[PDB]
Write a protein that binds this ligand. Sequence first.
Ligand code: HEM
Ligand SMILES: C=C1CC[C@H](O)C/C1=C\C=C1/CCC[C@]2(C)[C@@H]([C@H](C)CCCC(C)(C)O)CC[C@@H]12
Ligand SMILES: [Ca+2]
Ligand SMILES: [Ca+2]
Ligand SMILES: [Ca+2]
Length: 402
Amino acid sequence: ALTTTGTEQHDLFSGTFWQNPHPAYAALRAEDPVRKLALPDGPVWLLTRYADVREAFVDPRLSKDWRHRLPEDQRADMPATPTPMMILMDPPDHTRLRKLVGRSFTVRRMNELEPRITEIADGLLAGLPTDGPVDLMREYAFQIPVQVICELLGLPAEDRDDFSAWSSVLVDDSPADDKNAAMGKLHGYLSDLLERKRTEPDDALLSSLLAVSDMDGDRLSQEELVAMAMLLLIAGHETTVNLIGNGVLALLTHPDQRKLLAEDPSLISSAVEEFLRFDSPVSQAPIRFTAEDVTYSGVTIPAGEMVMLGLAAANRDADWMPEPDRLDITRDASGGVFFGHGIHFCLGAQLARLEGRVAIGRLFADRPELALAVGLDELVYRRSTLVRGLSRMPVTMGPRSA
Ligand code: HEM
Ligand SMILES: C=C1CC[C@H](O)C/C1=C\C=C1/CCC[C@]2(C)[C@@H]([C@H](C)CCCC(C)(C)O)CC[C@@H]12
Ligand SMILES: [Ca+2]
Ligand SMILES: [Ca+2]
Ligand SMILES: [Ca+2]
């Protein structure tokens, strides 16, 4: 397996890394900040220093076009993406699609969801038992964002078990064959769903976008439309859930910070920025491809290579954040690469922040005796190069606040 070089040897993307990657990240930052990882599916580079990561995000030599892996001899015949999602594109197609969908994630729009998000969270909390076993992931942290995304897009509730399964395979260490099958089922499901929406539209996002596409197919093609729906669905299942989980765990493991939040519940939005920094839910940005040689921290990555920007790593870089290993919900947050940076900056950043503060804020308000029901060392994490996420979180809710 892989380990960090230098003065300290820590497992990388195997072994102890899944439980707690943060020591490994620190050893990478200190001693190997531009690291080639000889992973099973092929080598991937990893940048972990904050200044390198932040600038890389605006370096066009680090492209989303996967054809850069190929010699020029082979790029001509090949599609620009495996699925035409904007996160897998460079400008101009990225610019067009982002501008288009960005129109539905305007500042007033997401906030007008607060009342419903709160009702969803409050309903979930009222349904949780006082001391029987609760997996806080499946029963709360997962449920809030999935319900919100289903309502925002107009996804049938009856189909949730099917598409939640396809979604999870795409984001973890599942075999390439399995991922290809999952994407196929999701593409088919959403294609069929859009066909049905044409005949009976609703007021939710997928109908609105289908209408745009119907009116002007050069602004949004049918295939782009399905790929957008797929991207938004998967983001709705696999991101915010781990802000909730990781943030809850941070409070559970830091009584001092939990006490500060209990004493000033209004710290919750500052607290959310701090959870995003301290245990970033998107651990490595999805892959970029070197379109030419690039040099970071004295290390040249050749053209044609795959590159992850290490967000969890960079957000604990002491060169950027003093005492980066300290959880401090009172920090006046600024910078931070947990939502990315530049043209692909998280489309859902406002929505995730709102979901996060509602879910975590209301949970601790409703159940101020919440506690883990296992030791910290018994917690199981997902194996993924994309997400830092608990597989389950055994808790005891304790009594509802009076
Ligand atoms: C919950 C915490 C979330 C985190 C930590 C997060 C993280 C990120 C990051 C790091 C990127 C940039 C990736 C890169 O440049 O390679 C990104 C982009 C993106 N995110 Fe989020 N995300 C979250 C929630 C969401 C939600 C709720 C949505 C639903 C709308 C969403 C939709 C998107 C989309 C569509 C992009 C692609 C944007 C573009 O290419 O222009 N995200 N996210
Ligand atoms: C969770 C997050 C974190 C970052 C954003 O919020 C959006 C998001 C997920 C959805 C993603 C992540 C980037 C690339 C993904 C994983 C796509 C794959 C590259 C599609 C091709 C899959 C395969 C293996 C069939 O060839 C499918 C859904 C996309
Ligand atoms: Ca119940
Ligand atoms: Ca309508
Ligand atoms: Ca500095």
